[PDB]
C-alpha cells in the first residue's frame, strides 16, 4: 500500500543487503563441498536442488528490496543457465564483488558510466584472450574428464556418457528420461522411427509375441480415410503379382478397409500392414516428405500431379526392413539417394536460424538423427525423483560441455585461466586514469569466485590465491586432491562458452545496474 | 505467510525434534508389544491403526521444518509400503540413528560426499552378502510359519492362506474379500466368472435358488450385437439336431431374440442361456481367445473373413458345465489343448513386467489365474472396519512374503544376519579416512533397528545386544516370548526383498539428508 | 524468581553472540589504522578514546546475554588495567581466538579438561621461552623508542620522558599530574618538598615571590601545638647567640603562637616562620623521623621525655638552606649521613614490598625518592578534556614501559616473538591425544596479534604471517609503515610482564569459561 522512493546511498544500502543475503544463500552451496538447498512447492514435498536457476526462480521473501534485487539479477542467471546451467554463482559472485568495488568507486566519487565502459572493453579483450587460451578438446579421455567435472566429480557418469557418445557418434542427439526401474539403460533409435502400436491386434505377422518385421516392403502413403473400394487397386494388384509385403502410412482407414486388409493378410492373400497418422498436420506432412527423401520414395496422395486411386508403382517407398510392434515402428535402412540427402541438408541449413528458435532447431535435429544420426537415451535409475532430476541436469550440462568441446575445445578449469588472463591483461590502458582505476578494481574483484571456491573447500583463500599468483603456466591447486601442480594434467577443463558468456553477461548487467541513483518500491 | 530463510544446523535441530516425535509415535506400533494409535478423522470416528503408512499419510506438524522433513521422509515410507507394506518402523529408526550420526559428524565438520560414498559401498556389500545368506526355503511348512508370523502369530489366518495358495497353486492368485461373520471362510471356485445373472429370469434352470447348471455346454462367439439380424437360425438348428445346449455370449441382445429364445426353451426344443460380454472391447477381445483356447475354439469375430452369418457347428467351443445365477455367471471347465494356453501365457509373460505397474497388474494376474489357476474368495472373521483392515493388510503382507520366498527365499528375522554381517564387516574400508568413518557410521546405525526392537518390550537393549554379539549363526532371542535360543528354531523370518529395499531406500534418503544446508519457508 | 537455564549449545550461541559483539567493539582501536570509540556520558561529554581497557572496564551492555558475556570477559581487562595498562586489546583477541577454537574443538567432541591442561602447560612453556628470549633495554635511545611506541608514537613526549628519567635517575620516582598549557612541563623536585603554606602575611621575606630563603636555619619539628608556654626562651636565646634564622614545624599553630612569633618577626631578632605538618597525624609523624634524620636533627617529642628547656645544637635540627612559600615548603639539602639515610630507606622498602600497592605506598616511594634522589612531576594540559585524557593514558602507558625497561627490559614486540616461539612450541606433547590437541590449540591461537594487525590494516593476513614466520629475529612487518624489514631497529618492543601476564591469565580464564555446560540467568 505505502510507497517508498529513495535516492543514492539510501537505496544502495538496501540493495547491498539484498545482494549479501542472496550471496549468503547461494555462493556457499556451489562446488563439491557446496551443498543442496530445498525449495518448497505448495501441493507436495519440497524439492532438494543445487541448480542456480531453480534457486533464483524460487527466490521470494517478505522484503521487497531483496525481492526486486533478486528479480533483476535473475535475468543474467537465466541467460547463463540457458547457456550453461552451472557456474552461475561464479557470475553472481563476480557481480557482487564488483558491486562492492563500485561502492568503493562511488565513495571515490567516480562516474559509473565511464567505469562500466572501460570494464566492458576489458571484458571484451578478456573474451578474445580466452578464445586464444582455448585448447581443442577431441580425445574421449578429455571428454570423460570434462563430463566427470560437469557431473561434479562423478566418474561413473563421465565414463557412461563418454562411451555413449563414442558409440552413437558425435551426430547422436540425446533427449532422455529415466524409466521406472533403477537400471541404467542405453537405447539407440536408428533412422526413421515413431513409437506406435498396432492399429488392430490382428496385425500379428510372422514374428511372434505380436512382433512385425517385413523386409523389402512397398511403403504407401495415405492422405485421408481412403473410402471407395479398398483404394489403390493398380498398386494392390501389382503387389499381388510381386508378392512382397506392403506397408501403409495412413492418415485414416475405413473400418471396412481395415476388415478387408485383415482378410487379405491373414488369409495369406497379400502381406499388408498399416500405421496410423504419425504426427500433426503440416508436421506429419513434413515427416512424410522427409521419409520420402529417406526411402527414395514420394509422398503418396492425390495432392500431387496424379490422383490417389490410379497411380504408378514408383510412388511407393522401399527400405531394407520395417519393424512394427505393439509399441514402436522403425525403418531399417531405407534406400534414398545422397543427392536428396544433401537437399534435405540444405533445407536443414535454411531452417537452422529460426525466429521461433527453440523447439524448431530440435525438431530439425530430430530430422538430422532420423536421416543420418541417431537418438541416444540412457535411463539412469535411482530412488528419488529429486535425484533423477539432479542426474538429468548434470547429464545435459555434460552434453552441452561436449558440444562446446567439439565445436571449439576447452580451457583450463578451476579459474586458473581466469587468473592467468587477469595477470596478462592488467596493463591495458584507457582514455583516463579513472577508466584505468575502474578496470583495475574490476580485475581485483574478478578473483572473488576462486577465493569463494576455496572458502567452500573449508580452506584459506589468501594462501592459495597468492601462491597461484606466484606460480605460472598450469600451476594451480586442486582442493579435492589437495595438491599444487598442473590442472590440465589433472584434467580440470572448462568449456569456453560457459566462462565467456557468464563473464560477459554478469559484467554487463552489474556495470549497468551499479550506476543507479534512485529506486521506487511498494510496501504494505 | 511471510517468507524467510534458515540455514543448516539451526533448522536441522527443529527437523530432528519433529522426526523424533514421529519416530516416538512409530515405535509404539511395531512388534508384539506394539500398540495401536488413534488418528483423528473428520469424516467419521478416528481410525485406530497399527499401520505405519496409515499414520504417515496423515502426518502434519505445526513447525515448517519438521513438517517438510516429514514430507521428505514420507517418500521412503510410501515406496516401502508399495513394495512390502511394513518395515517403515525400521526405516524410521535407521533414519533417526543416521540423522544423529550425521549431525554429530557435521559438528565435526566432516566431509559429506565421502560419507555418502562409504555408505553406498557398505550398502552394496550388504546387498551382496544378504543375497549370499539367502537360504532356499520353499516348504509349505515354512510357508504356513511365515504366514502365521506375518499374521502376528495367527495360526488360523496363516493356515487359511497356505491352504488358499495350495488350492490355487504356486502361480495361482490368492485374493482378499470382505468379511461379515466372526469365522474365517475360504472358498475356491473354478472357471471364468463374472457378475452377470441370466438376463431373463425365465432362463433359470430347474434347480431352485437361481441355479442354472448346463452340462456339456457349447460356446458361441458373436463379435457384434446379433439379436436384430436374427440369421443364426441355421447354426441354431445344427445345434438342435446335435441335441446340445448352446450358450450365447454376445455384445447385446434385444427383446425380440430374447422372447423367441424364451419360447424355444419353454416349448422344449433347446435349453439356452444368453449373457452379454463382461468387459471392454479390447478386454472382451482379449478374453475371447482366453475362453476359446480354454474351450478349444478360435476367436469368432466379424472383422475377419469368417462371419457369424455363415458358420459351422465345429466353430463353437466345448465345456464340461456352466453355472449361471443372478450373482455370477461362470464356466467350470473348458475342453481345449493346453499348449495354446501355455504359448499365449508365455507371450503374455513377455507382456507382464512393464513400467505400467498399477492399474494393469490386477487384470494381468486375474487373466493369468483364470487361464491357469483358480478363483479364491476369503471372508474375514473380524467385527469392525479397523479390524477388517488390519487382518486384510496382514493378508497382503503374507502374500508378499510368499512371493519373496518363492522367487528368492527368506532369511532369519529380527536382524540377526544384520548384526552378524556388521560384525564381520568391521574392517571394511573406503577410499580415505572419511569414507572409513562413514562405514563406521553405517556399522553403528544399522544397530538402531535391533536395539529399538529390544526396547519395544520396555527393556534395556544392550544386554541382548551383547548376548547376540557373543552368539553366532542363527543364535537369537525372542522378545515376544522373551527367551534366547536359535532364531530359526523360534521361527521368525525376514524375506530378503523387504530388508534389501529398506536398506537401499534408507541409504538414499541418508544421502539426501546429509546435503541439506538451507531452506526458504513461510511464517503465518 | 527469574530463572532461565541454557544447556550445551543453548548457552553457547548467546555466548558466541556476546563475544562477537565485544570483539567487534574491541578490534576498532589498535594500530595506526585503528580509530577511536565513544565512551558516552549522560552528564558531560563522552570520551573519544583508543585504549581497549579504558573502554571495556567502564562499559556495561544492558541486554541479558551480552551482559553475561561482558561480565565474564571484563575481569581480565580490569586486572590488566590494575597491573599492565596496555595490550588489553591483544589479550582480548587472544581470548576470542582460544574460545573460538575451543568451541569448534567441543563441536569435534574433544575433552575440554585435557585441552585446558595442555593449554596451561603450553602457557608455562611459552613463559619459559619468553624469559629465555628476554633482552634487557639499557641505552637511552631504545628507552625513548619503547616509550614513544607505548605512547602511541608521540615522539616529543617520549623523548621528554626519557630525558626526565635520565635526570631523575633509575630509582627516582616519576609522577604525572594535570597541567594548564598544551605543553607538558618537566618538574624536578629535590630534597624535602611538602605542601604547606605560611599563615600570617608578615612571613613574606623576599618580595615578588612569597619565598623565604633561610640562611641554614635551625629547623625544629614539633608534634605539639604551641598554646600554653608562650616562652621558647631555651631555644630562642640559643638562636640569639647563633644569630641565624629559624624555622618551625608544628602539629598546629595557635593564635597565641602566631601572635608571639609575629611580634618576634617585627622585632627582627631572626627570621621566624612556622608551618603545620603536611598530612594526618600518623603520616606527619612518619615524615617527622625522616626529616629529622636527613637533617640530622631531633623532633621534639611530647610523648617521650624531653622538652624545649633541655635543648642543644644537635637537639635542634639543621639544614643548609630551605625555601618557604604560601603553598609549599622545600628543603634543598639537609645534614645527614647516607649510612642511616639508606638504612631507614632499606627498612622502609622492607615494608614497602607489601600487598599495599595503594596511594599511601605510592607516596611512600615518593617520600623515599625525596630522601635519596629527585622526584619527577609532569604537568600535562591540553585544549580539551578528551585530549588531556588521551595524553594521560599514553603517558601512563609510557610509564609502564619505563617500568618494564628498568626492571628487566623489553622483548620483541608486535607479537613477532609470539609467533617465533610458537614455531618451536609445536614440540610439546601431553598425556594423550586430547592434551595434544589442547597444546596445538596454542599453535592455532597465537595468531591473534597477526590477524588483528592485518584486520586493522585491511591486507592479506595468511601470507604476511607465513612470510614473517619465514623470517627470524629482528625481521618482521611494520603496520605503522606497513612494510617488512628490521623491527628492532625501530625499537618495536613489548614489556615482558604485560605480555606474559596477559597471555597466561587470559588462557586460564577463557579455558574455564569454554568448559561451561550450563548457565542460569533472569527473565525480564
From Swiss-Prot, chains A, B, C:
Which GO CC terms are listed, alphabetically?
cytosol; GroEL-GroES complex; membrane
Anything known on activity regulation?
Answer: During the substrate-folding cycle, the two GroEL rings separate for effective substrate binding and chaperonin activity. Ring separation is triggered by ATP binding to the trans ring of the asymmetric GroEL:GroES complex and avoids formation of functionally impaired symmetric GroEL:GroES2 complexes. Activity of the GroEL-GroES chaperonin complex requires Mg-ATP. UMPylation of the chaperone by SelO/YdiU negatively regulates its activity, and may facilitate survival under stress conditions.
Reaction(s) catalysed by this chain, per the record, are: ATP + H2O + a folded polypeptide = ADP + phosphate + an unfolded polypeptide
UniProt GO molecular function:
ATP binding; ATP hydrolysis activity; ATP-dependent protein folding chaperone; identical protein binding; isomerase activity; magnesium ion binding; unfolded protein binding
Q: Which residues carry this modification: N6-succinyllysine?
A: 33, 50, 116, 276, 320, 389
Domain of life of the organism in this record?
A: Bacteria
Give the record's GO biological process terms.
Answer: chaperone cofactor-dependent protein refolding; protein folding; protein refolding; response to heat; response to radiation; virion assembly
What family classification does the UniProt entry report for this protein?
Belongs to the chaperonin (HSP60) family.
Q: What is this protein called?
A: Chaperonin GroEL
Which organism was this protein described from?
Answer: Escherichia coli (strain K12)
